[PDB]
Amino acid sequence: QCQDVVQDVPNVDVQMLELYDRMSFKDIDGGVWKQGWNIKYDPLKYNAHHKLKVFVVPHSHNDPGWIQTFEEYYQHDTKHILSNALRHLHDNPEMKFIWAEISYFARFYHDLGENKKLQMKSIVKNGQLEFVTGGWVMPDEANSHWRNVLLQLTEGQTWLKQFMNVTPTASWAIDPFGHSPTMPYILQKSGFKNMLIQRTHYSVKKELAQQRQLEFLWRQIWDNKGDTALFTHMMPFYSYDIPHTCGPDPKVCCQFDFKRMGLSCPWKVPPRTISDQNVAARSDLLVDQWKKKAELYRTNVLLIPLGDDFRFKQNTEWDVQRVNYERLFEHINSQAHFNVQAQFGTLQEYFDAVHQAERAGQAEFPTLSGDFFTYADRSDNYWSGYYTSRPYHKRMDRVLMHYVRAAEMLSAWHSWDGMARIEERLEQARRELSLFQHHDGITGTAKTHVVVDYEQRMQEALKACQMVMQQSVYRLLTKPSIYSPDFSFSYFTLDDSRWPGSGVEDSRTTIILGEDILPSKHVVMHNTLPHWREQLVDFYVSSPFVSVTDLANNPVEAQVSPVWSWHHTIHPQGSTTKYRIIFKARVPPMGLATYVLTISDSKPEHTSYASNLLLRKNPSLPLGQYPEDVKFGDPREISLRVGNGPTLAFSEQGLLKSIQLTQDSPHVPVHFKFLKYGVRSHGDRSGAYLFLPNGPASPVELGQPVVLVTKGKLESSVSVGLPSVVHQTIMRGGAPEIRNLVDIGSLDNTEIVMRLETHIDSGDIFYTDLNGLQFIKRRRLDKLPLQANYYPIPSGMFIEDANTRLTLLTGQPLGGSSLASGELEIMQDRRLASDDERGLGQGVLDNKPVLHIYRLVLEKVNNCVRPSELHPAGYLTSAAHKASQSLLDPLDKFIFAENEWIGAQGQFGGDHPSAREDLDVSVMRRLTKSSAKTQRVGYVLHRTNLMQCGTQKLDVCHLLPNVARCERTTLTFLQNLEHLGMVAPEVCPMETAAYVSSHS
């Protein structure tokens, strides 16, 4: 029995879209607390019976890459911090410390002698060193896919459980640049009870501070019942540093950062050593700060973080921080007139205390739905820039996301011999991808050399996945009686037509066929999705005279197109030595399908040939053996249709102007246009973080560009060489695919945007997704500057009136908006000469060619059951969801390396159940190595919610044979929540559930 997530609108105290509408966002000088007010408390609030309980929580913010690489930071800082944490906590039993980034902690702990490891275990066992979140990293929450958020969590917690027998239930996220409700969603399904956040808009901090709504029960925007709710603490002030964590006046709080006496206080009053001669006056000053902070919160329990970036490095910082705070605590606790108990504490300690206060009925907490984007730290400094910064690696994230899913799924079907090194490869791949989830990784907010490290690590991870996938496929499709593997040998190379993209790197392999050299070639397609899929696939072939069969030698209809490249005035050139064979692979759920490419004399029976039309003035171009000559013509408008699918009209610069859905229905206008944003000459400069445009975007001079039109029975495309962008519309008989080869070059202080202009009556309403999990209603707010109407576009955005919807699906996270009724726009790249003064200490001048990929879905929704007009969520159609699925998890292509393949079977997984379209097996992962008694395999099942507009049961517990046991688990697989006999019940719309099947 499942919630309805469409018709029922949840009741919450704070709904962030609603709050945003009714908020003035006035940037008033508030006093010592610049972005709030002068806090008052009644001092008779406190007495011997109602005391203020103060937890002072030492911490050290450790970036796994930012100004330095992971390994640079490890050697310069983090190993010294964790060594000293070990020593000082051992010697000082009341001293406490929290640690978030398990990537750094695993690096450290594995390097320890056995004595140190057991000393480390003792300070974690007695709760002195407490792990918070326990993720590999503290992830980005804007650009990150929920799958990779769960991956990095799963990897840090699995490491903590294996090596420290602990699983944190309190999250600490002090640095991500705005906050997603995806985090509570995953954490609450991973056994968490509490989470803390910091970087929310100063006007939101003020508004919530005023109603003491900084602690709230954060539920998903669709959850009527509140089962998703997680207790959230929002910190009230500008920073997580010591000046902004003691209370409202940083000039006072900075005096209680005892490390600042080659560091100083900006407010020019230094810390002073605490003595019997000044402790009374210092404690008065400090407790006054504490009691002002407590006014903003509903319990008599107060959280005081004590730290900053890479703090607790030197042994004397540990002494000076600990000893001075001891003296203060000694004085304050001994002196009844304060009515304070103050002590070193952990985050869990804080939350426990707050819950005890809730139980005792001391406080009742408000409910909240929504997100905390776009973040502004002051004035108009909105952090929408990093939604696009380093878009190459943003793209690379999504490709590696898929290769890790595919590698884990393919290698999961079987136990492997350790000589195969499957587990080594998958651990490397998970960890490089996990590291990139860091809030200076996927964000593009790291120094040039660190981005290079991230790229080289993800490159290595891609090669590890390829090796696992090709080994796996060879095993799945070779006769058992023949299968005799060389675990070091390349049986298949992978073909990927979308990463990096030919035009970024000309690196795809050409299958070389000859009547004598080599007449045929086995190819295999993998389908990670759990339903039958039929998708056009392509390969490079050395002859255009190629025919496709399955292994059973049934002909398959195919099309051959030329291989086109673009060069510098920007014009295409065709190959005379390679061709694209295009055909429809039918692949089973979570399955494999084999096909054969065979050469012939001449045009084979079942292979068509695309025409080519080169629209320019002053035309010519050979194509070797390509049997249809390249035609020429002057720039002009062009219509194209593939299959019964839509009919697209293109300008004479090869940009979409119109879509006709069906043969009766109208030519709906849909104009693609490239524009620029610039940087402010005066005042605040755009950087890796901040988007600060000098006014609305201004159109790009296109000139007369060369337009290439390729027309074929299975696939046609319109390509054009614009300055900065080779734009391409590909048609295969449904929603078209948009490809931009973006080369911003050295156009300093430029942001290239792509805008869609329709007559859709959207108004001020658009929808953007969070972490590729949910779509959230946005409202353009004219009261906020442009950069504040920019939101993350991690996997899609859409506009709609009562009749029409346009959805743009992305293969990469980029920033975007709807800045006017019937518009969508999405930034492609940004080049920025200036730093934006958030500590990166450079601009963005390392741009490189990236191939961005999209699907464009124009649909009628007048017949779709749309949620209440008051609902803060949107839901994709089946067609838009399947289009996102085609971008993020396409079919994998495998070319057999060797001349002959004995044992070859033509299919795997034909028996596998084809689950409802809204269901996905997000994760298949074998949880046990071979040496193990009982093999265990984890499945994450996510079910989305599709808009209804008028399939076999999938039980993952049975996918593998000899199932002995089957548990519903936390999403990390670390805790059993339910023994099941051993059927997994399917999951509600917008729900995610994990299961582990055991095998005898």
Are 907 and 591 within 8 A, CB to CB?
yes
Interface stretch with Zn ion, choices 61-69, 542-550, 553-561, 678-686 (CB under 5 A): 61-69
**Dist CA 146 CA 126 (whole Å):** 33
State which of positions 195-214 bind Zn ion (CB under 5 A). Answer: none
Nearer to Zn ion, 373 or 677 (CB): 373
**993 vs 1000: CA distance, rounded Å:** 24
Residue nearest to Zn ion (CB): 175
Pick the stretch among 60-68, 887-895, 902-910, 980-988 that binds Zn ion (CB under 5 A): 60-68
Q: How far is the CB of 176 from Zn ion (least distance, A)?
A: 8
From 168-176, 241-249, 282-290, 449-457, give the range in contact with Zn ion by CB under 5 A: 168-176
Helix axes 391-412, 448-477, angle to 10 degrees: 30
Candidates 160-168, 174-182, 454-462, 923-931 — which segment interacts with Zn ion by CB under 5 A?
174-182
* 115 Cβ contact partners less than 8 Å away, ≥ 6 residues apart: none
Stretch that binds Zn ion, among 169-177, 197-205, 527-535, 615-623 (CB under 5 A): 169-177
Residue among 180 and 724 whose Cβ is closer to Zn ion: 180
695-724 binders of Zn ion (CB under 5 A): none
Pairwise CA distance, residues 630 & 706, whole Å: 14
- Smaller CB distance to Zn ion: residue 309 or 550? 309
Q: Choose one: 62-70, 262-270, 562-570, 594-602; the region binding Zn ion (CB under 5 A).
A: 62-70
Q: Residue 521: beta bridge partners? A: 597
Residues in the chain: 1000
- Give the relative orientation of helices 146-164 and 102-110 as an angle to the nearest 10 degrees: 30
Contact status: 63 vs Zn ion (CB under 5 A) = yes
Q: How far is the CB of 748 from Zn ion (least distance, A)?
A: 27
Q: Which is nearer to Zn ion, 308 or 349 (CB)?
A: 308
How many chain residues interact with Zn ion (CB under 5 A)? 2
- C-beta of 385 vs 712, nearer to Zn ion: 385
Residue 100 or 593: which CB sits closer to Zn ion? 100
C-beta separation of 616 from 635 below 8 A:
yes
Give me the residue label for tokens 């996997």.
Answer: 795
Catalytic residue among 175, 249, 453, 538: 175
- CA 784 centroid distance within chain: 26
Nearest distance in Å: CB 518, Zn ion: 53
Eight-state DSSP code of residue 33:
S
Question: For the chain, what is the largest distance between any 2 Cα atoms, rounded to a whole number of angstroms?
Answer: 100
Q: Does 77 bind Zn ion (CB under 5 A)?
A: no
- Whether 175 is a known active-site residue: answer yes
Q: How far is the CB of 313 from Zn ion (least distance, A)?
A: 16
Q: Which is nearer to Zn ion, 175 or 432 (CB)?
A: 175
Our CB check for Zn ion shows the closer of 174 and 731 to be: 174
What separation, in Å, do the N-terminal and C-terminal C-alpha atoms of the chain show?
33
Q: Three-class SS of residue 36?
A: coil
The residue to which tokens 């690379």 are assigned: 396
Shortest distance in whole angstroms from residue 177 CB to Zn ion = 9
Determine the Cα–Cα distance for residues 744 and 489; give it in Å rounded to an integer. 40
Pick the closer one to Zn ion by CB: 63 or 991.
63
Least distance in angstroms from the C-beta of 310 to Zn ion: 10
Q: Shortest Cβ distance from residue 840 to Zn ion (Å)?
A: 11
- Residues 836 and 818: beta-carbon distance below 8 Å: no
- The nearest distance, CB 138 to Zn ion, in angstroms, is 7
Burial of 105 (0-12, 13-18, 19+ CB in 10 A): buried
Tokens of 463: 């090669």
Task: Give the nearest distance from C-beta 63 to Zn ion in angstroms.
Answer: 4
- Sequence-ordered list of residues with C-beta below 8 angstroms from that of 664, at least 6 positions apart, any chain: none
The Cα-based distances of 281 to 53, 302, 328, 559, 703 in angstroms read 20, 21, 10, 84, 72
Using alpha carbons, select from 194, 228, 17 the residue that is nearest to residue 990. Answer: 228
Q: How far is the CB of 276 from Zn ion (least distance, A)?
A: 39
Beta carbons of 930 and 974 less than 8 angstroms apart: no
Query: Where is the binding site, in residues?
Result: 61, 63, 175, 439
Amino acid at 630: V
| Secondary structure string (H, E, C) spanning 305-362 | EEEEECCCCCHHHHHHHHHHHHHHHHHHHHCHHHCEEEEECCHHHHHHHHHHHHHCCC
DSSP 79-120: HHHHHHHHHHHHH-TT--EEE--HHHHHHHHHTS-HHHHHHH
- Minimum CB distance to Zn ion, residue 175 (Å): 3
Rounded to whole angstroms, the Cα distance separating 724 from 746 reads 10
Distance CA 545, CA 551 (A): 19
- Nearer Cβ to Zn ion, position 73 or 202? 73
- Is residue 71 within 8 A of residue 108, CB to CB? The reply is no
Nearer to Zn ion, 62 or 547 (CB): 62
Residue 628 interacting with Zn ion (CB under 5 A): no
Residues forming the annotated binding site for Zn(2+)? 61, 63, 175, 439
Among 175, 249, 800, 823, binds Zn ion (CB under 5 A): 175
d(CA 514, CA 543): 8
Q: Which is nearer to Zn ion, 308 or 955 (CB)?
A: 308
Shortest Cβ 111–Zn ion spacing (Å): 23
Residues with Cβ within 8 Å of residue 205, at least 6 apart in sequence: 35, 36, 214, 234, 236, 237
Q: Which stretch binds Zn ion (CB under 5 A): 58-66, 510-518, 578-586, 607-615?
A: 58-66
Binding track, positions 14-53, relative to Zn ion; x by CB under 5 A: ----------------------------------------
Cβ proximity of 770 and 180 under 8 Å? yes
Stretches 171-179, 224-232, 649-657, 845-853: which one binds Zn ion (CB under 5 A)? Answer: 171-179
d(CA 785, CA 762): 20
Residues belonging to the active site? 175
Binding stretches for Zn ion (CB under 5 A): 63, 175
